[PDB]
Design a protein around this ligand. Sequence first.
Ligand SMILES: NC(=O)c1ccc[n+]([C@@H]2O[C@H](COP(=O)([O-])OP(=O)(O)OC[C@H]3O[C@@H](n4cnc5c(N)ncnc54)[C@H](O)[C@@H]3O)[C@@H](O)[C@H]2O)c1
Ligand SMILES: NC(=O)c1ccc[n+]([C@@H]2O[C@H](COP(=O)([O-])OP(=O)(O)OC[C@H]3O[C@@H](n4cnc5c(N)ncnc54)[C@H](O)[C@@H]3O)[C@@H](O)[C@H]2O)c1
Lengths: 332, 331
Amino acid sequence: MAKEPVRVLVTGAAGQIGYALVPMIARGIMLGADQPVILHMLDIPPAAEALNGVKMELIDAAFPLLKGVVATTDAVEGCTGVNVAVMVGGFPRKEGMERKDVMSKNVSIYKSQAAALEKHAAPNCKVLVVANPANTNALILKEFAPSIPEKNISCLTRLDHNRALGQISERLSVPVSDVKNVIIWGNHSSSQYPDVNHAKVQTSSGEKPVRELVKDDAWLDGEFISTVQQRGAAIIKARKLSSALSAASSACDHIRDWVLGTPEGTFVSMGVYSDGSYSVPSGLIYSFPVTCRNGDWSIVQGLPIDEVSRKKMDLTAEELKEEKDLAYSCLS
Amino acid sequence: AKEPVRVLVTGAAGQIGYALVPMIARGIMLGADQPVILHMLDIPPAAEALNGVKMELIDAAFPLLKGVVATTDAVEGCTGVNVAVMVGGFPRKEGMERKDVMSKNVSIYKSQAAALEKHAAPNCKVLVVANPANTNALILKEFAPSIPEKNISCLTRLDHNRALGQISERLSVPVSDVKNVIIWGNHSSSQYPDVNHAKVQTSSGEKPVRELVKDDAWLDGEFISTVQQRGAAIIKARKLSSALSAASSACDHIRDWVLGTPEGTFVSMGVYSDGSYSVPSGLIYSFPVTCRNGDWSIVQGLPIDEVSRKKMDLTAEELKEEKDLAYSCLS
Ligand SMILES: NC(=O)c1ccc[n+]([C@@H]2O[C@H](COP(=O)([O-])OP(=O)(O)OC[C@H]3O[C@@H](n4cnc5c(N)ncnc54)[C@H](O)[C@@H]3O)[C@@H](O)[C@H]2O)c1
Ligand SMILES: NC(=O)c1ccc[n+]([C@@H]2O[C@H](COP(=O)([O-])OP(=O)(O)OC[C@H]3O[C@@H](n4cnc5c(N)ncnc54)[C@H](O)[C@@H]3O)[C@@H](O)[C@H]2O)c1
C-alpha cells in the first residue's frame, strides 16, 4: 500500500460521465486497490452547486483510498499538481448528431485548458481526453501545450475497443474475459476501423482466432463494424443520454493499462500521437494497438495490413486532418 | 470461487441502479475474484432505458460479469438469485405527501416479497434501499415469512458512511482513520448518529472521537443535525437524491455482510429487531453489527446514557408510526 497519493483530475466532473467516473477512481479501479488517490474535480460556474453536491457524495461514501477532494471551477486550482488528467469537460451530442457536432462548443475548452495543464500539472502528468470529438480535442490540447511530452497525451478509443469485445462475446456466447486483441484504428467516429484480424478467444482447446470461431466473415466485415461504429448513437436512442457507465469504466481501463501495464499477450487501443507507424501521417491523435509498460505506450508493430485495411486506415487519417482544420476555424 | 453469484438489482433503470450495476460488475460488492451474473428488474415504462443499461454493461467488457438478464417480470428477475438489492421505488418529489410516498412504495414490497420467497436461491441475502427503507424492508419481511428473518435488511450504511465523513472532515483526517460510528433506528431524520464508541487512528494510537474533537456541543448538536439532514442537502445541491454514495454504501453493506466486517470494526445495518437494546422486537431497526459467515450479529452491551436512550426510543416510535401508515395503505 503506497503512502504517496496520486492526484487525479476529472474535468466535466458535475456531468454524467464525471458522476459515473469519480467513484470508480475513489474505489481504486483506475490505479489499483493499493493506491490512495486525491481527486481534483473541475467544472464551470453554472454547475458550481451540482459540483459541490458530487463532492458531498464522495465524502459521504467514506472511500478509504480517497485522501482529498478539490471541487472547483478554477482551472489553475484544478490542474495544480495533477498526475493523471481525465478530460471529460464539454457538451455531449444529442440524438441524431455526429460526434463531430460538439466541436464548435468544445475545442475552445481544450485550447484554454492546455495552457492550464502545461503550466500547473505535475511534469509527467498523463492526459486522457474523453470529451468529443475526442481525437481532435486531444490534438488541439497537444498543439497548445507544446511542452507536455507528446507521449503523455491520449484520447479514449477504449470504449470502442470494449464495445467490439462485447460484440464478439455476445455473438459467440463466451465470457468477455476470454476475448482479447481487437483493434480500433483511427478516429473515435464512424470512420474508425474495428479490426478483428488479430483478435483471439480463449477456449478449452487453446487460443483461437475470432474469425475461425465466428465462421461469418461477412458479418465481421459488415454489420459488426457498423454496430460498433454506431453504438454510442444506439445508447442515446435507448437512454436519452449518451454512454456514461461504459465510458467511465473504459476510461478507468485506459489509464489502468497505461500506468500499471498491459497483461502479457494482450494489446489495447489508445488514441496517441502518431509517429509515422503504419504509414499513418505523423502528428495526429490516432488510435493504434499498443502495449504499455513502465508507464509508456508502445505501438504494436509488425501486424499485416491488407488493402482493405490500408484504405480504411487512410480514410480515417484523412478525416482527422479535416477535423483538425475545421477545429482551428472554430477557434479565435 | 468459480461459480458466479447471481445478484438481483430492482429499480435497475433508475439513478441508483445506473451507479450500482457497474460497481457490482467490477467486483466491488463481492470481491475482485468473484464472478457475478446480474439480474436487472424494472417496470415496463422504463424497458427501453433498462435495455440501454444492459447494452452498456456489455460495452464495458467487465471480465467478472458472466451474464445480464434485463426484465420487467419480477419472477424472472428473482429466480435463483443469491443477493437481492431492492432499489425499485418512487423517490419523493415536491407535492408528494408522506402518505403518498408510503403508498406508492410499500405496495411494491408486498408484491415482490412473494416472488423472492418462492424463487430466490436458498439463503439469498436481501438489502432494501428504496425509501422508506426500514418500512419497505419490514413489509417485505412480513409478506415473505419463509425467508429467514436474519436475511432481510435495509440500508443505513449511507447514514453510517456520512457520519464517518463528517468526523473525517471536522478533524481533517483521512476517512480511513475513522471507524465505529453507529446509526441507530430509522433511515430518516429521527436517526441517532452516535459517536460514543467511535475511534480515530492518530500518531499516538486509537483515540475516542469525543476525546479528539473536544467539542461535545458540535457532536451532540450540529453533527447530528447534519447527518439527519444530509440527504436533503444532496437534493438541494444536485436537484436529485443521492446515487453515487447510495450505490457505494449498498456495496459496502453487502460486502461486509457476505465477506465479513473488517477486524476491530462494526457497521450499521437495518435488521429485524429481537428486543436487543430495549428497542421493540419485530421492527427493521438499525443496530451496530459485526458480520461473519454471512450473518450479522448485534454488538451488545454498549453503554447507553440517558440522552442516547431517549433518541433511540424516539426513532423506534417513528418506525411504529411508519408501520401503521404502511398498514393503512395496504388495507
Ligand atoms: N468514448 C468517448 O470518448 C465518449 C463516450 C461518451 C461521451 N463522450 C463525450 O464526453 C463528454 C461528456 O459527456 P457527458 O454525458 O458527461 O456530458 P454532460 O453534459 O453530462 O457533462 C459535461 C460536463 O462538462 C462540463 N463543462 C463544460 N465546459 C467545461 C469546462 N470549460 N471545464 C470543465 N467542465 C466543463 C459541463 O458543465 C458538464 O457538467 C461529451 O463531449 C461526450 O460526447 C465521449
Ligand atoms: N440510503 C438509502 O436508503 C437511499 C439513498 C438514496 C435514495 N434512496 C431511495 O432509493 C430509491 C431509488 O432512488 P433513485 O434516485 O434511483 O430513483 P429512480 O426513480 O431514478 O429509480 C427508481 C427506479 O425504480 C423503478 N421501479 C418502480 N417500481 C418498480 C417495481 N415495481 N419494480 C422494479 N422497479 C421499479 C423505477 O421505474 C425507477 O427506474 C428511492 O426510493 C430513493 O428514495 C435510498
